[PDB]
Amino acid sequence: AYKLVLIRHGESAWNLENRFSGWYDADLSPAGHEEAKRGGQALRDAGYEFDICFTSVQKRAIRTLWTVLDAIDQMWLPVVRTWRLNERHYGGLTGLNKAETAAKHGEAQVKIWRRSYDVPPPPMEPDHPFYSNISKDRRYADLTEDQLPSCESLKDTIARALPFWNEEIVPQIKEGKRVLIAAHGNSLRGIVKHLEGLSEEAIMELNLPTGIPIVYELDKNLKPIKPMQFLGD
Amino acid sequence: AAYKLVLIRHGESAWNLENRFSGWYDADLSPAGHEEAKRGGQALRDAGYEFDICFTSVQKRAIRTLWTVLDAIDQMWLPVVRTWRLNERHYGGLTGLNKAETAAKHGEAQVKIWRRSYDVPPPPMEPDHPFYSNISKDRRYADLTEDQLPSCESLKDTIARALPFWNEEIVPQIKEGKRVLIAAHGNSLRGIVKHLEGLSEEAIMELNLPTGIPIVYELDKNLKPIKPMQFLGDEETVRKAM
Numbered sequence: 358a359y360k361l362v363l364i365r366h367g368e369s370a371w372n373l374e375n376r377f378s379g380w381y382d383a384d385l386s387p388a389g390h391e392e393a394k395r396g397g398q399a400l401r402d403a404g405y406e407f408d409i410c411f412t413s414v415q416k417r418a419i420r421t422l423w424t425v426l427d428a429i430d431q432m433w434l435p436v437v438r439t440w441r442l443n444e445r446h447y448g449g450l451t452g453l454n455k456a457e458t459a460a461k462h463g464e465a466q467v468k469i470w471r472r473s474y475d476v477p478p479p480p481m482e483p484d485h486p487f488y489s490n491i492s493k494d495r496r497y498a499d500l501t502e503d504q505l506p507s508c509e510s511l512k513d514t515i516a517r518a519l520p521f522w523n524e525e526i527v528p529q530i531k532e533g534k535r536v537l538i539a540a541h542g543n544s545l546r547g548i549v550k551h552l553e554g555l556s557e558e559a560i561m562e563l564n565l566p567t568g569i570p571i572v573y574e575l576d577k578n579l580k581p582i583k584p585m586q587f588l589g590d
Numbered sequence: 591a592a593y594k595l596v597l598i599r600h601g602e603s604a605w606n607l608e609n610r611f612s613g614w615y616d617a618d619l620s621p622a623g624h625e626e627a628k629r630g631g632q633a634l635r636d637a638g639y640e641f642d643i644c645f646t647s648v649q650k651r652a653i654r655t656l657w658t659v660l661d662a663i664d665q666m667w668l669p670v671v672r673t674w675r676l677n678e679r680h681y682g683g684l685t686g687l688n689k690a691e692t693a694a695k696h697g698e699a700q701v702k703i704w705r706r707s708y709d710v711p712p713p714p715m716e717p718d719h720p721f722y723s724n725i726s727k728d729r730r731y732a733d734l735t736e737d738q739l740p741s742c743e744s745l746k747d748t749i750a751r752a753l754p755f756w757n758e759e760i761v762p763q764i765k766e767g768k769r770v771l772i773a774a775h776g777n778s779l780r781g782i783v784k785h786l787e788g789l790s791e792e793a794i795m796e797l798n799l800p801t802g803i804p805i806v807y808e809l810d811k812n813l814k815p816i817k818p819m820q821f822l823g824d825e826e827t828v829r830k831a832m
């Protein structure tokens with residue numbers, strides 16, 4: 358009866374979670390920090406122990422993990438970071454609020470992007486103010502040309518998260534290590550879709566809560582034995 | 591030089607405020623020790639330092655110092671490796687005692703022996719010690735062999751178990767070109783410095799690394815220092831550390 362815990366980070370600075378924060382390395386707001394604090398509170402109240410932690414290379418998820426480890430007195434745990442758990446790359450939309458997105462591209466196209474599993478936003482181009490900030494960031498210097506996205510469909514995001522799940526996380530779960538994953542809405546979507554065998558439409562309707570420990574109980578073949586559970590009140 | 595290595599010793603802990611022996615007890619930083627780490631991280635940020643991998647102990651006063659530095663230099667994304675081999679010296683039965691309790695129980699002559707000696711350990715931490723289960727039964731040491739888990743350590747013991755991690759895990763990374771940052775403790779960092787500089791027992795026992803201060807080594811391809819250690823900081827802070 359393996360136990361797996363996911364946590365999605367909370368609010369980022371400057372309202373960037375409502376501005377397609379994407380691969381821009383926005384920090385948590387103080388409220389998002391408090392969210393992570395309460396999630397860690399909940400994990401420690403329930404007496405949870407972990408053996409290894411996985412997170413992205415984005416500081417809002419890393420800081421969520423740090424806050425949780427602090428609260429549960431497990432800062433000594435091994436931590437593994439990977440770009441494959443990063444948030445979806447929103448291309449040229451990154452940093453724009455909803456009104457600006459609709460102004461620039463029109464409501465028809467925005468609705469198409471919102472409802473599509475496999476259509477990416479426009480690429481982030483050199484005139485985008487985040488272009489060099491993300492694409493030339495040292496943390497991605499080992500990625501090959503086709504690994505570093507200029508934009509991602511949801512299909513793309515899940516396609517680059519799942520090799521990490523299969524290759525690095527699954528072997529740990531199968532050895533009995535109690536895994537904690539602190540990551541982002543869409544990378545965690547990829548994991549949940551793989552675990553529950555959800556359809557494209559279903560995963561696109563799934564909106565995981567933030568700051569809340571999400572608990573899975575898996576059988577020998579890593580199939581959930583019951584619906585995902587939340588920790589708290 | 592071919593390579594650059596940076597060390598940082600954590601600052602004041604909650605038990606330092608109580609003048610208690612921590613050793614392997616997992617005391618957190620005091621607010622002032624946290625502020626020390628922030629200033630060291632700021633010094634690394636001002637100097638434009640970049641790292642590729644970080645090593646630390648399994649003790650939160652060192653881990654939190656690393657976290658604080660990584661935050662300051664905006665390199666929170668770096669790989670981090672934790673190891674018990676970088677832990678503070680294990681003070682055995684003295685763990686949890688303060689200065690007065692130690693002097694009262696053991697006397698001046700014995701305490702001077704322990705202070706001055708390279709290879710005489712303090713008394714062992716026995717099963718009835720108040721922190722025995724808290725430390726020796728902590729699941730973070732579950733994979734240590736029976737001989738690896740200390741009941742007490744002389745400085746020679748501490749250095750003897752830190753240096754295998756240096757040789758087997760850190761040296762290969764440096765020679766692979768990785769820019770290493772080590773955030774650890776006075777006595778485990780003493781082990782590294784003694785090896786790097788070929789210092790005597792006498793010399794390493796007289797070395798007190800400053801806390802919260804980035805310590806910079808410029809190393810040739812054989813990991814031999816090309817010059818004495820450098821301290822990073824403003825004129826004032828670097829002068830206090832001489």
Ligand SMILES: O=C(O)c1ccc(-c2ccc(Cl)cc2O)cc1NS(=O)(=O)c1ccc(-c2ccccc2)cc1
Pocket residue numbers: 681684689692693694697698699701702703704705712
């Ligand atoms: O100064 C400290 O309190 C001290 C505290 C801890 C240690 C110490 C202990 C164990 C280890 Cl493994 C490492 C250490 O560094 C050394 C100290 N300094 S001392 O020069 O040796 C000294 C120790 C006792 C006394 C004394 C005793 C009884 C009645 C009156 C006076 C006077 C001087």
Ligand SMILES: [Cl-]
Pocket residue numbers: 436670
């Ligand atoms: Cl970490």
